[PDB]
Amino acid sequence: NRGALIKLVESRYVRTDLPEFRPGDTVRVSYKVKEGNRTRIQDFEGIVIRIRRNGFNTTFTVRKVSYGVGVERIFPLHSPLIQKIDIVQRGRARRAKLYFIRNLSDREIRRKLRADRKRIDQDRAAERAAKEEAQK
Amino acid sequence: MKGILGVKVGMTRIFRDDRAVPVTVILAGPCPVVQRRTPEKDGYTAVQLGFLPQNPKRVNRPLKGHFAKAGVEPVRILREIRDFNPEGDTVTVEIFKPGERVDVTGTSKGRGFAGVMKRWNFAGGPDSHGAHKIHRHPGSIGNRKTPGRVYKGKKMAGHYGAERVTVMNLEVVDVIPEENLLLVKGAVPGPNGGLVIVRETKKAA
Amino acid sequence: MRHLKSGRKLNRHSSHRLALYRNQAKSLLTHGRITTTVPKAKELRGFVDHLIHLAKRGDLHARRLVLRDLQDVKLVRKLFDEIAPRYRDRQGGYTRVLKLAERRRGDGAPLALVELVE
Amino acid sequence: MIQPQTYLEVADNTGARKIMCIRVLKGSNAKYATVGDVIVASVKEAIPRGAVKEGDVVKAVVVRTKKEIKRPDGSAIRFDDNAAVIINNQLEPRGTRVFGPVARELREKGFMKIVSLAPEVL
Amino acid sequence: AKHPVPKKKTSKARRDARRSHHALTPPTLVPCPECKAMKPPHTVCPECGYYAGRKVLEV
RNA sequence: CACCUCGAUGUCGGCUCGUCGCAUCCUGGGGCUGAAGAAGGUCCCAAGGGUUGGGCUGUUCGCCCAUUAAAGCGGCACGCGAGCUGGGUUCAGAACGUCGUGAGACAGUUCGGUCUCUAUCCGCCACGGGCGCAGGAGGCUUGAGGGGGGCUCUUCCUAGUACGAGAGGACCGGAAGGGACGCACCUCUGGUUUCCCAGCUGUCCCUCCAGGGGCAUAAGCUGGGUAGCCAUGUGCGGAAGGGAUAACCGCUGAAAGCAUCUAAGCGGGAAGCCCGCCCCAAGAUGAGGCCUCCCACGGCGUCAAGCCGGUAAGGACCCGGGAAGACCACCCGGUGGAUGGGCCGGGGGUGUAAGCGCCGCGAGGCGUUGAGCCGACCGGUCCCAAUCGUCCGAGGUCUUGACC
RNA sequence: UGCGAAUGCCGGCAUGAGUAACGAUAAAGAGGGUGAGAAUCCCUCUCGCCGUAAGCCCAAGGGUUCCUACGCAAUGGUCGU
RNA sequence: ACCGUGAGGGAAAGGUGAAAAGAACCCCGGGAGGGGAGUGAAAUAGAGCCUGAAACCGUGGGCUUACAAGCAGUCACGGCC
Ligand SMILES: [Mg+2]
Ligand SMILES: [Mg+2]
Ligand SMILES: [Mg+2]
Ligand SMILES: [Mg+2]
Ligand SMILES: [Mg+2]
Ligand SMILES: [Mg+2]
Ligand SMILES: [Mg+2]
Ligand SMILES: [Mg+2]
Ligand SMILES: [Mg+2]
Ligand SMILES: [Mg+2]
Ligand SMILES: [Mg+2]
Ligand SMILES: [Mg+2]
Ligand SMILES: [Mg+2]
Ligand SMILES: [Mg+2]
Ligand SMILES: [Mg+2]
Ligand SMILES: [Mg+2]
Ligand SMILES: [Mg+2]
Ligand SMILES: [Mg+2]
Ligand SMILES: [Mg+2]
Ligand SMILES: [Mg+2]
Ligand SMILES: [Mg+2]
Ligand SMILES: [Mg+2]
Ligand SMILES: [Mg+2]
Ligand SMILES: [Mg+2]
Ligand SMILES: [Mg+2]
Ligand SMILES: [Mg+2]
Ligand SMILES: [Mg+2]
Ligand SMILES: [Mg+2]
Ligand SMILES: [Mg+2]
Ligand SMILES: [Mg+2]
Ligand SMILES: [Mg+2]
Ligand SMILES: [Mg+2]
Ligand SMILES: [Mg+2]
Ligand SMILES: [Mg+2]
Ligand SMILES: [Mg+2]
Ligand SMILES: [Mg+2]
Ligand SMILES: [Mg+2]
Ligand SMILES: [Mg+2]
Ligand SMILES: [Mg+2]
Ligand SMILES: [Mg+2]
Ligand SMILES: [Mg+2]
Ligand SMILES: [Mg+2]
Ligand SMILES: [Mg+2]
Ligand SMILES: [Mg+2]
Ligand SMILES: [Mg+2]
Ligand SMILES: [Mg+2]
Ligand SMILES: [Mg+2]
Ligand SMILES: [Mg+2]
Ligand SMILES: [Mg+2]
Ligand SMILES: [Mg+2]
Ligand SMILES: [Mg+2]
Ligand SMILES: [Mg+2]
Ligand SMILES: [Mg+2]
Ligand SMILES: [Mg+2]
Ligand SMILES: [Mg+2]
Ligand SMILES: [Mg+2]
Ligand SMILES: [Mg+2]
Ligand SMILES: [Mg+2]
Ligand SMILES: [Mg+2]
Ligand SMILES: [Mg+2]
Ligand SMILES: [Mg+2]
Ligand SMILES: [Mg+2]
Ligand SMILES: [Mg+2]
Ligand SMILES: [Mg+2]
Ligand SMILES: [Mg+2]
Ligand SMILES: [Mg+2]
Ligand SMILES: [Mg+2]
Ligand SMILES: [Mg+2]
Ligand SMILES: [Mg+2]
Ligand SMILES: [Mg+2]
Ligand SMILES: [Mg+2]
Ligand SMILES: [Mg+2]
Ligand SMILES: [Mg+2]
Ligand SMILES: [Mg+2]
Ligand SMILES: [Mg+2]
Ligand SMILES: [Mg+2]
Ligand SMILES: [Mg+2]
Ligand SMILES: [Mg+2]
Ligand SMILES: [Mg+2]
Ligand SMILES: [Mg+2]
Ligand SMILES: [Mg+2]
Ligand SMILES: [Mg+2]
Ligand SMILES: [Mg+2]
Ligand SMILES: [Mg+2]
Ligand SMILES: [Mg+2]
Ligand SMILES: [Mg+2]
Ligand SMILES: [Mg+2]
Ligand SMILES: [Mg+2]
Ligand SMILES: [Mg+2]
Ligand SMILES: [Mg+2]
Ligand SMILES: [Mg+2]
Ligand SMILES: [Mg+2]
Ligand SMILES: [Mg+2]
Ligand SMILES: [Mg+2]
Ligand SMILES: [Mg+2]
Ligand SMILES: [Mg+2]
């Protein structure tokens, strides 16, 4: 027995070091790349378009426009190749997956996605709190 | 030719060396050898194995406390590892080290009565133009007066799946003696929870 | 193949399969014991065990939820005030299903019994 | 995944705008071209006086695909269009200056001029 | 499709051998826990079915 | 030619599905070359596997585009219409050219024009029932014999070496990537997910409001979507190796003092053959073997086999079920029990319920609240149901040879 | 005046076979009643379908099908009270 | 009768017994049917009634058949009844 508990044992690859976010709010993920036997940390930053929750190997995809072409990247949420991920802004999604933005991509999405104050306000307030409460 | 019984647990991915490595973890528990075969009494060479210790006694009367290590007699004994003559009793997953290649026998998910096209990846009929109720159908099966019959291997629809299947040369990614786990990449046959037997490869041996 | 798939279609499309389970619930809760065919029965259990359990919750929300399927206000009172309490210390299994030895004559159907437990 | 009949955006300045795949050059029978694959194309829409004319049969390499590219590191990328760069038979760009992102798979397939000329490589 | 038709009237031998599986099985019955009569198992008896739960009353 | 078929053997082409032949298109092995190398030419061996996608035409064929290792040729009623098509041909309508005074007519053209749910036998794919396998049982397995499979390219190192004035450019040996095909799998990617959540319109309704139900498809529409089934997704396969051979290359060697691979011998030598791999497999009536069980009752048959009744090991039946499945089978349970259902925990999906408070004239907005709802996935728990039972099942044929 | 054949004629009975099918995919569930017997009849409740109709009225045509009592052999594509 | 708008077409279908003596009454059964009883020279003359053939269906018995393959017979030997 413990069919899932065994496969759930299987991960020493879970990682707690990355931030909370949901679809709709924009983030920036730094990712190890090769680029000809050298090594670089490339950043990729756009709206997170969706999140697939499987526990370990959940994955989340990020969309942005780059030099006049939309791009989506799909990252494994536990990937050993993610150095860090910063949330660069929060936004109010209204539904789980937003693919609908692909056929907007214009000003109409900054109207559809207006920033989520509740989670913004609780970020600052969480950052003031942890800042004040570490030192003294 | 080392081998051990197990059950397919489930799949996941492992991130080894900045690569994904999808893996199928099969649990191969301790395996209490209950018989040996000899060119003397038998005419070939193997071990009976035995697995999944359960039943209190459903075992009833024919049994072996003859080798007596059948203490806590196991549900499935599935046996031959063929030419395998191990160290002592009780083969473990210690048997395999990572980077070892292995073949895996198992029982393919049963599809029951399955069309040609999914049995045999036939083409089927067009979905339009003439059409008329042959979209999923096999076509001609033969010629005319000669031979005036149907070849003895002729691919047709019937029960497909739920059969013996051995996918070969799989890489052992990891082995976890602690919980008796083992990690191979990919193809291994059949449902989670089904029995699999796991042998050294035939690429070299 | 339709492997590890839960729940029966019983020779009727979805909306009729709903109406079936609802109309069996209203009837069972009403008479306390009912005779259907064995498979329609085995499949009624879950439908009402949940309907009952939500009455054990008692909250207005939980009522309104039961009111979606059972739809009749008076029955819901009888569910909430009369029936629900009897199970308060019963965790699960608020229904019994017992097979009858008589085959329905003229379609041949196996019959069973469905009653609220006690 | 590109196949014959597929239209492609032209990601360089040669003067082609749209090309349409006519063959994918991989094997005898390869079914689809992807990022880093060379195809043969007919030039469908082209800007006046270009290096390249409408109707020319040419070779292109595929720098972008609407169908996601999967990487070993477990991740994927996908772009908003399918795009190609028109190339000569020695297989280097016919243009100066490519436009928009290119897939990093190109480097690995040996196209170092185009990845270089590319504004962003993802 | 054209009209497949049987080519030969089948022998009495042959239909009767077709039917070699057609024979019935008697219903499987067990003696009633309380009452005298026979009942197919796992079924509430046509007379006084069970104990703990409330049987259909022939009582 | 006119032999079976005119009380009917459906006719081109396509499609589907192939199977065979080899006079071999490619790949493998070879000899000769007017074979420097690379690349060809020609002929020999070889049928294992492979043998592309388009434009045009009803086309076969052919021509052409773009590729390729190659874009083989034949046969199987010009394979295959109780498998499909119906563009062509090949009824009836209509027109053109042409022929005919005409009615009409044309391997001349044009547009149109009914392709028949139900498989008895053989054959083929699957799956069971019976009996047999001379004592009966529960396991486990040998493999006679079958089947599957069998392709190939680029690049790189060797080495810009050998060879060549140069340009070009090997053998052999090694490495890494592909294509297409196969088997499996669902972690990822990507689909479906008929009621898992949400939103929306019209109407009717419960109960006026709030909230909600029906219907708008066999989901009203829309946005998503677990398991499962899936390919676009992933893993793995072709081998290695062993043997015998083909053409061929040789050794030794006469007949024939020489010579000769051959007449006696022997060694090399193919993607082919036999093994090797994978799958089936003792109805292999030639019914195999191993482990373990139960036992050698009672009567009649005083006897060649038996018979009847309980029995024994064991099975069935019935029931709860199952990534097993058309039914049957197979597998797991059956209270000394976690088998299904319910409940609970988790996963997962939807995306912050209802109620209430506050802001706004209002539509609405905020908070409570990642809320509420929540199939299947991983578990837990005897609350509901797998209760109680019933039936069947050996007591072992003889001859013959070796043991206390 | 003699039958084995005439795709003979008339009748009977087989085979195919317990096979196809049981005639619109608007749809059913339960409780009670009746009766020798009930999925199929009666009554309640719930669910679904029609609503420029699948409701109502008239003309053709049909000719007792009308209402009621008693009744189930057959007719009813099953059953039938 | 039926079929055809019509002219018109156009069938099947005989037999208890000498005599109804046409089976009271009891039993099973809702009836149908049957078992007894009774009638009769006779009731497999019982009204679906003289005789009652054959194909066809069935029950019981004997011989036989699950490693044989065929126009089904025939010739021979052997077994069992
Ligand atoms: Mg667990
Ligand atoms: Mg299945
Ligand atoms: Mg297949
Ligand atoms: Mg298709
Ligand atoms: Mg169709
Ligand atoms: Mg034919
Ligand atoms: Mg033949
Ligand atoms: Mg199922
Ligand atoms: Mg049905
Ligand atoms: Mg509906
Ligand atoms: Mg290059
Ligand atoms: Mg048809
Ligand atoms: Mg058919
Ligand atoms: Mg002739
Ligand atoms: Mg003549
Ligand atoms: Mg003819
Ligand atoms: Mg004929
Ligand atoms: Mg004919
Ligand atoms: Mg040849
Ligand atoms: Mg060659
Ligand atoms: Mg050369
Ligand atoms: Mg040559
Ligand atoms: Mg060949
Ligand atoms: Mg065109
Ligand atoms: Mg055409
Ligand atoms: Mg031509
Ligand atoms: Mg071609
Ligand atoms: Mg051919
Ligand atoms: Mg010909
Ligand atoms: Mg032909
Ligand atoms: Mg046809
Ligand atoms: Mg035919
Ligand atoms: Mg035509
Ligand atoms: Mg005619
Ligand atoms: Mg004229
Ligand atoms: Mg003509
Ligand atoms: Mg003509
Ligand atoms: Mg027309
Ligand atoms: Mg037509
Ligand atoms: Mg035949
Ligand atoms: Mg059998
Ligand atoms: Mg063999
Ligand atoms: Mg073989
Ligand atoms: Mg070099
Ligand atoms: Mg999954
Ligand atoms: Mg998926
Ligand atoms: Mg899913
Ligand atoms: Mg009201
Ligand atoms: Mg309202
Ligand atoms: Mg309504
Ligand atoms: Mg509404
Ligand atoms: Mg309506
Ligand atoms: Mg509807
Ligand atoms: Mg989707
Ligand atoms: Mg030789
Ligand atoms: Mg010599
Ligand atoms: Mg000599
Ligand atoms: Mg010789
Ligand atoms: Mg040799
Ligand atoms: Mg090979
Ligand atoms: Mg086997
Ligand atoms: Mg055997
Ligand atoms: Mg045996
Ligand atoms: Mg089942
Ligand atoms: Mg069992
Ligand atoms: Mg349970
Ligand atoms: Mg969640
Ligand atoms: Mg809110
Ligand atoms: Mg106010
Ligand atoms: Mg939950
Ligand atoms: Mg417990
Ligand atoms: Mg019949
Ligand atoms: Mg049939
Ligand atoms: Mg059928
Ligand atoms: Mg049917
Ligand atoms: Mg009907
Ligand atoms: Mg109907
Ligand atoms: Mg209206
Ligand atoms: Mg009138
Ligand atoms: Mg009339
Ligand atoms: Mg009348
Ligand atoms: Mg009336
Ligand atoms: Mg009446
Ligand atoms: Mg009647
Ligand atoms: Mg009737
Ligand atoms: Mg008349
Ligand atoms: Mg008398
Ligand atoms: Mg009598
Ligand atoms: Mg007589
Ligand atoms: Mg008489
Ligand atoms: Mg007389
Ligand atoms: Mg008579
Ligand atoms: Mg008989
Ligand atoms: Mg034999
Ligand atoms: Mg025999
Ligand atoms: Mg035969």
Q: What gap in Å lies between CA C94 and CA A46, rounded to an integer? A: 52
Question: What is the Cα Rg of chain B in Å?
Answer: 22
B19 contact residues in D (CB cutoff 8 A): 72-74
Is residue C49 one of the residues assigned to a domain? yes
Experimental method: X-ray
Q: Is D54 buried (19+), middle (13-18) or exposed (0-12) by CB count in 10 A? A: middle
Is residue D93 within 8 Å of D73, Cβ to Cβ? no
Q: Which residues surround ligand 1, an ion (CB under 5 A)?
A: A 2, 5
Q: What is the DSSP string of chain A?
A: --HHHHHHHT-S-----S----TTSEEEEEEEE-SSSS-EEEEEEEEEEEEE--STT-EEEEEEEETTEEEEEEEETT-TTEEEEEE------SSS---GGGGT-SHHHHHHT---HHHHHHHHHHHHHHHHHHH-
Q: How far is CA A78 from each of CA A81, B170, B203, D74, E53, rounded to the nearest angstrom?
A: 9, 26, 35, 11, 54
Smallest CA–C1' separation from C107, nucleotide: G39
CA-nearest of B151, B157, B152 to B116 is B157
CA distance D3 to D62: 11
Residue B61, both tokens:
């009367």
D2 in Cβ contact with D65 (< 8 Å): yes
C41 assigned to some structural domain: yes
Q: Give bridge partners of residue A29 from the DSSP assignment.
A: A44, A85
Distance CA B55, CA C23 (A): 44
Give the residue numbers spanning the domain of C87: 14-118
The one-letter code for the residue type at B86 is P
Provide, as residue numbers in chain B, all residues whose Cβ is less than 8 Å from the Cβ of D73.
18-20
* Rounded Cα gap, residues A5 and A14, in angstroms: 14
Report the Cα D50 to chain-centroid distance in Å. 18
Q: H or E segment at D33? A: none
CB contact under 8 A, E50 and C98: yes
CA D31/CA A95 separation, integer angstroms: 38
**C7, part of any domain:** no
* D39 touches D24 (CB < 8 A): yes
Number of CB pairs, chain B paired with chain D, less than 8 A apart: 10
Q: Count Cβ–Cβ pairs < 8 Å, chain B vs chain C.
A: 4
B163, amino acid identity: E
Position D116, amino acid: S
Which nucleotide's C1' is closest to C13 (Cα)? F218
Q: Quickly list DSSP for B87-147.
A: SSS-B-GGG--TT-EEEEEEEPPP--EE-TTTSS------SSTT-SS-TT-------SSSS
C86 in any annotated domain: yes
* Cis-peptide into B126, omega within 30 deg: no
Structure tokens at A7: 């496969």
Question: What's the half-sphere exposure (Cβ side, CA atoms, 13 Å) at A39?
Answer: 6
Helix axes C45-53, C14-31, angle to 10 degrees: 60
Which residues in B have their CB inside 8 Å of a CB on C? 109-112
Neighbours of chain D (3+ CB pairs under 8 A): A, B
Nearest protein residue to nucleotide F70, judged by CA and C1' positions? D28
Q: Which residues of A touch B180 (CB under 8 A)?
A: none
Q: How far is the CA of E42 from the C1' of F386 (A)?
A: 9
Residue C2 counted as domain residue? no
Q: Residue E12, CA: closest nucleotide via C1'? A: G15
Contacts of A76 in chain D (CB under 8 A): 74-75
**Which residues lie closer than 8 Å to B94 by C-beta, 6 or more apart?**
B175, B177
Q: Token pair of E9, please?
A: 């009237």
Residue type, C2: R
Q: Integer distance in angstroms from CA E4 to C1' H11?
A: 36
CA-to-CA distance for A70 and A63, rounded, in angstroms? 7
For D45, E51, E52, the CA distances from E36, given in Å and listed in that order, are: 94, 16, 19
CA atoms within 13 A on the CB side of E24: 3
Distance C117 CA to ligand 71 centre (A): 22
- C80 belongs to a structural domain: yes
Residue D108 corresponds to which tokens in the numbers above? 């690995």
CA-nearest residue to E44 within chain C is: C100
In a domain, C1, yes or no: no
Q: How many domains does chain C have?
A: 1
Burial C20-32 (b: 16+ CB within 10 A, else e): bbbebbbebbeee
Residue C109 touches chain E, beta carbons under 8 Å = no
Cα distances from B166 to residues B188, B201, C70, in angstroms, run 8, 11, 53
> Does the nearest atom of strand F lie within 7 Å of A13's Cβ?
no
Task: Go through chain C and list every residue after which a break occurs, taking a C to next N gap over 2.5 angstroms, comma-separated.
Answer: none
Other beta carbons less than 10 A from residue D9's beta carbon? 19
Resolution of the structure, angstroms: 3.1
Chains that touch E (3 or more CB pairs under 8 A): C
In a domain, C9, yes or no: no
Q: What are phi and psi of B93, to 5 degrees?
A: -75, -5
Burial A111-128 (b: 16+ CB within 10 A, else e): ebbeebeebbeeeeeeee
Q: Please give the DSSP secondary-structure letter assigned to residue E44.
A: B
Count of CB atoms situated within 10 Å of the CB of B1? 14
Nearest CA to CA, how far is B38 from chain D (Å)? 47
Distance CA D96, CA B112 (A): 60
Report the candidate in D79, B173, D73 with the shortest Cα–Cα distance to residue A59.
Answer: D73
**Nucleic strand H within 7 A of Cβ E7:** no
Give whole-number Cα distances, A87 to A94, A127, B143, D5, D122, in Å: 18, 13, 69, 42, 20
* CATH code, domain carrying C90: 3.90.1030.10
Find the CB nearest D120 among A35, A66, A102. A66
Whole-number Å distance between alpha carbons of D6 and D81: 11
Length of chain E: 59
CB-based touch C/D (3+ pairs, under 8 A)? no
Residue with tokens 């014991």: C33
List all residues 6 or more positions away from E19 whose beta carbon is below 8 Å from its beta carbon: none
| DSSP track, A25-56 | SEEEEEEEE-SSSS-EEEEEEEEEEEEE--ST
Strand F close to C73 by CB, under 7 A: yes
Chain B residue with the nearest C-alpha to that of D75 = B20
Provide CB contacts within 8 A for B166, sequence distance 6+. Answer: B103, B104, B105, B106, B189
Residue spans of alpha helices (H) in D49-98: none
Question: Which token pair is D70?
Answer: 């999967």
Query: CB–CB of D80 and A71 under 8 A?
Result: yes
Shortest-distance nucleotide from E10 CA to C1'? G15
Q: Exposed (0-12), middle (13-18) or buried (19+): which is B177, by Cβ within 10 Å? A: exposed
Chain E positions touching C102 (Cβ under 8 A) are 46
